[PDB]
Amino acid sequence: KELNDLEKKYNAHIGVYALDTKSGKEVKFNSDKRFAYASTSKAINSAILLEQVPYNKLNKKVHINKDDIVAYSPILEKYVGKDITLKALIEASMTYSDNTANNKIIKEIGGIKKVKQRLKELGDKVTNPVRYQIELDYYSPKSKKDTSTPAAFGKTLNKLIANGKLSKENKKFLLDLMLNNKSGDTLIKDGVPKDYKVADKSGQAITYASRNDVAFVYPKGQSEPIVLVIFTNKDNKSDKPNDKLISETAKSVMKEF
């Protein structure tokens, strides 16, 4: 099905950047149009922490103070005044999209300034992180704060995870969290065939039905993943989104690989 026919069918906007790391074949559609990346950045932050903490040092603990707690922290709320390992922080951020965990991970890495530097180093002059969370959910077409283009986020994901500095264990640790993430089931995981393996991380701004999914799809019979980034959104601030729009986009894009 056409991606443009899909925009019309769903009255949404579609940003898609895909890259088969084996052939280098790329599919693109509005790949340079900015969208809010939202909770998808939880995978970039996790990966940057993992670039600098060996897997064996993941048992390191940190203290959770009350001024650390941000909204929607189903896991970290239980840790006020307790110590929590780096491993458990990554798991809560990745698996329960915990906001305190993600903020803390950002803290461990050294703050936004540090995060912004890694990106520039990755050649990613597009992804523009300004706020943390839950404020990272407010999105507006007027501004490009906390927005990125499907191509930019795509190239970045590939260089940090698909081919970066992560050791084998850290990479297995992270991808595993993405393979077992249930929150992504109504998305890309829904649009590829049964034989394909999908390691994803979703996201959702609170405005303009901003719904996204980014993943590492493993073709039935391939070791190299296809990096698939799908950002979508609507025209009304108050628009509710449909996950079927991403499910279907994935089906389309996959016909090219």
DSSP letters of 178-217? Answer: HHT-GGGTTTHHHHS-TTSEEEEEEEE-SSTT-EEEEEEE
Nearest 10 degrees: Cα torsion 169, 225, 198, 14: 130
Which two structure tokens, joined as six digits, stand for 103?
Answer: 């903020």
Residues labelled as active-site residues: 39
d(CA 249, CA 241): 14
Query: Burial code of 99-118, b = ≥16 C-beta within 10 A, e = fewer?
Result: bbbbbbbbebbeeeeebeeb
d(CA 73, CA 95): 11
d(CA 125, CA 148): 9
Exposure of 32 in the CB half-sphere (CA atoms within 13 A):
1
Q: Per the structure, how many domains does the chain have?
A: 1
Which CATH number goes with the domain that contains 239? 3.40.710.10
Experimental method: X-ray
Whether omega for the bond prior to residue 48 falls within 30 degrees of 0, making it cis, is no
Look at the block and give the residue holding tokens 């990966």: 47
Query: Measuring CA to CA, which residue among 72, 77, 91, 106 is closest to residue 204?
Result: 72
Query: Do 146 and 129 meet the contact criterion of CB atoms below 8 Å apart?
Result: yes
Question: Does the annotation list 252 as a binding residue?
Answer: no
d(CA 88, CA 84): 7
Residues contacting residue 135 through CB under 8 Å, at least 6 positions apart? none
Residues contacting residue 147 through CB under 8 Å, at least 6 positions apart? 34, 35, 36, 37, 128, 139
Which two structure tokens, joined as six digits, stand for 184?
Answer: 């992504």
Query: Measuring CA to CA, which residue among 29, 22, 27, 39 is closest to residue 4?
Result: 29
Q: How many C-beta atoms lie closer than 10 Å to residue 53's C-beta?
A: 17
Question: Does the annotation list 111 as a binding residue?
Answer: no
Which two structure tokens, joined as six digits, stand for 231?
Answer: 């950002």
Look at the block and give the residue holding tokens 């050294």: 110
Domain holding 253, by residue range, is 1-257
Q: What is the resolution of this structure in A?
A: 2.3
Question: Does the annotation list 81 as a binding residue?
Answer: no
Which two structure tokens, joined as six digits, stand for 226?
Answer: 């296809």
Q: Which uninterrupted H or E stretch holds 15?
A: strand 13-20
